[PDB]
Design a protein around this ligand. Sequence first.
Ligand SMILES: [Cl-]
Ligand SMILES: [Co+2]
Ligand SMILES: [Co+2]
Ligand SMILES: [Co+2]
Ligand SMILES: [K+]
Length: 304
Amino acid sequence: YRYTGKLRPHYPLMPTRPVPSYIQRPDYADHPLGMSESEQALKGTSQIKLLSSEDIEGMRLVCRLAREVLDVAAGMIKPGVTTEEIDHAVHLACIARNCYPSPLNYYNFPKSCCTSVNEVICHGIPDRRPLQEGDIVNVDITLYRNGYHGDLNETFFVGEVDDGARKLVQTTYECLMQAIDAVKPGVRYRELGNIIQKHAQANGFSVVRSYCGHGIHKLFHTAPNVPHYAKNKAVGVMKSGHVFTIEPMICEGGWQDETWPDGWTAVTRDGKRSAQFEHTLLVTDTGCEILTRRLDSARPHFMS
Ligand SMILES: [Cl-]
Ligand SMILES: [Co+2]
Ligand SMILES: [Co+2]
Ligand SMILES: [Co+2]
Ligand SMILES: [K+]
């Protein structure tokens, strides 16, 4: 394999971390390939669930707990901490909240969160590499509680970073929030990528095409598929009671991706940096509820 940048995996990985049996588990947790037969039953369907009041309460709860776990990870970012150490803290924080860490064993993913440094677009595997001053790192969290999943991610700075890192991370966050500001009943899901790409391109960046936002509720990933690029062909119109994520990945160079031999780590083919932010959103009768928002502070961590 020819690496695309400076990063390499730092092996061995710790043996997989057990989740105590008193924590309720999603179907894939005990499937030997980590397949989710509930998701597979709906593959290629574009119908979108209208959540009940009971489902809305379930999603509000799990999303608030997921935000608490991301904030634990944010407090750990500093030069010299490994991504496996971050993951270990996340794993324990999920269990302390009586939640299952949804990434764990999802299609055999080996860890409890994804850690994506520099040229990693998404799905980086926590490993033995210490974070380095000047890095950018995304942590992507999802929790499962009482049958519901809640999903969010943020990019962080490691120590002092260069101006290009500042600009990339700021622009990516603005792309997410411009999309969110457009969510309300009657808006087509395909419009969100028109908004995201306009802002990225105005600042000299590109938009990843291979990975999209998604429906999330009783399933981790389901309809709607929510692309982040312009002129896409996503199916569907927003209605009050829909729940889904917006999770744009923006790049310094070109948008093309490739996957490492581990089958998960997605990297820019040119080796230049990428950043991402994500919320889980509920459409309301007039707009949206940001289920994974911070309740206690005005800004994402990189601004704080
Ligand atoms: Cl995801
Ligand atoms: Co993912
Ligand atoms: Co996520
Ligand atoms: Co997501
Ligand atoms: K990254």
